[PDB]
Structure 1
Amino acid sequence: AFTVTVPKDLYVVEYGSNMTIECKFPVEKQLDLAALIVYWEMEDKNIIQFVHGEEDLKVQHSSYRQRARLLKDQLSLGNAALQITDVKLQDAGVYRCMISYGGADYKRITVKVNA
């Protein structure tokens, strides 16, 4: 059965720091981009939309522009790593990570910032 896995449900982090929220999905041998969809939202704000290898900066929410990046390096290891840099207080909430890979699941991640 297809199932998205989350190592850490809560992220405690600082203002101005860099965090990498992670989501594991089952990669068999070699990653078929033609089946892979990854989508991170937070409160219905589009943070990453990767569909079959294709992403568009224009569809990213204003809040998250130029700061927030899916790490492609990690995807062949079965890991949608969302990396935000220069973290702000307005970033903080329930992030949702949705993977499709011949089968679909999501998981929620809470993020608290300090200072």
Structure 2
Amino acid sequence: AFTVTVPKDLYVVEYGSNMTIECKFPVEKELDLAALIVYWEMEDKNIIQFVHGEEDLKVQHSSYRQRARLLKDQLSLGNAALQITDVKLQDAGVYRCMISYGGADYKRITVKVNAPYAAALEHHHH
């Protein structure tokens, strides 16, 4: 059966840094992009929906606009690599990578974001 795996489940990053998080999936021979969906989400926010070789932006959460990307060159290696730049505290939480490719599976990744008080206040909402 088709299984997605996460070699590294937990990421600890500093506020304002960039991070790349990864889920791995089986590629038998050559990757067929027509048969692949990669859907990243975190805590009920859509990050990436990548369908038939194209990122669909229609329901991407506005917090990731021009800040999250799928690293497409990694896909042929069976690597779904999500890069998020300028990490904020709202980027801390549980990510899910939902991958469809002759099968479907997901895994959870936990991200922790360290920040000093002044930075935590920057996007502290009421």
Q: Is the 8 A contact 2:49 2:57 kept in 1?
A: no
Runs of 4+ in structure 1 displaced over 4 angstroms?
Answer: none
- Could you tell me how far 1:56 is from its partner in structure 2? 2.5
Q: Work out which of the two has the higher radius of gyration on C-alpha atoms and give 1 or 2.
A: 2
Q: Deviations over 1:25-79 (max 9, x none)?
A: 0011111111101000111211000111122234210111111100000000000
Hey, what's the Cα distance between the residues in 2 that align with 1:57 and 1:104?
21
The number of residues matched between the two structures is: 114
Q: Is the 8 A contact 2:98 2:107 kept in 1?
A: yes
TM-score, normalised via structure 2 length: 0.87
TM-score normalized with structure 1 length: 0.95
Identity of aligned residues (%): 99
Q: Give the 3-state SS of the residue equivalent to 1:59 in structure 2.
A: coil
Structure 2 spans left out of the alignment, 5+ residues: 115-126
Query: Conserved in 1, the CA contact under 8 Å of 2:89 and 2:113?
Result: yes
Shift of 1:80: 0.4
**Comparing 26-35 and 70-79, the one that deviates more:** 26-35
The runs of 5 or more residues in structure 1 that have no matched partner are none
